């Protein structure tokens, strides 16, 4: 197989969610955090032609950036990874699939409670401001007919009452109310625009970030609330 720069860039972003990954044959990749709070998926333009588990994905991608463009990724004789061209060959260990946490199945996300979106520049601002203000927790809620994202420091604010950053996503035309709480450590989406699908039912909840090249599903915190009584 040949992995283009776009695919390796996606795999590098997936490496921030999980140190390893399970690659299945086809044009689809997916991963999940070890604690299962974060999920990512993407259709790639390259064709994976064999199944292989990689324990240190970030180290594997570092090697790929150093080989020639015409290098071929194949399965070696002893059952590991072979990255070779007509002049040089690099070997990389293939991991036991039991040592890499992988999703049992993709998350289709067929329903939603509220649909909104976030621009690339606004997502970039949220990520950079959260580091300067020590924001570890965001809440997607409705305020004055607007869907907004509020940032908090939950370590110093357990009830999430002191807003340190607020981002207005757009108008909200509804009497439905909700406070969808997301851990900033799970906001691992790559730069770009994202459609935001919010879903909650009882004590379960999840948020889907639909991007131009990949999708991200993030679990909501237990303190999330919602009211769909219309």
């Amino acid at each position: 197989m040949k992995l283009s720069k776009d695919t390796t860039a996606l795999l590098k972003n997936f490496a921030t969610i999980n140190s390893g990954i399970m690659l299945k044959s086809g044009q689809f990749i997916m991963t999940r955090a070890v604690n299962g709070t974060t999920y990512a998926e993407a259709n790639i333009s390259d064709v994976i032609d064999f199944d292989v588990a990689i324990y240190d994905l970030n180290g594997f991608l570092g090697i790929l950036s150093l080989v020639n463009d015409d290098a071929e990724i194949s399965q070696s004789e002893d059952g590991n990874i072979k990255i070779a061209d007509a002049r040089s060959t690099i070997f990389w260990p293939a991991a036991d699939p039991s040592t890499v946490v992988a999703p049992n199945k993709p998350i289709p996300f067929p329903v939603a409670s509220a649909v909104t979106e976030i621009k690339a520049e606004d997502l970039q601002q949220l990520l950079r401001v959260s580091r300067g203000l020590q924001i570890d927790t965001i809440a997607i809620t409705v305020k004055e007919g607007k869907i907004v994202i509020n940032g908090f420091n939950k370590v110093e604010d357990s009830a999430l009452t002191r807003v340190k950053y607020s981002l207005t996503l757009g108008d909200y035309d509804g009497e439905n109310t909700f406070n969808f709480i997301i851990n900033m450590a799970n906001m691992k989406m790559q730069p770009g625009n994202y459609k935001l699908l919010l879903w909650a039912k009882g004590k379960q909840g999840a948020a889907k970030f639909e991007g131009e090249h990949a999708n991200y599903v993030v679990a909501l915190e237990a303190d999330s609330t919602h009211d769909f009584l219309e």
Binding site: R32, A33, N35, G36, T37, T38, Y39, P103, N104, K105, I107, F109, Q204, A206, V217, A219
Partner: peptide, 9 residues
């Protein structure tokens, strides 16, 4: 358990 209610659907 995170998104396990969607992984095991």
């Amino acid at each position: 358990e995170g998104l396990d209610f969607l992984f095991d659907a």
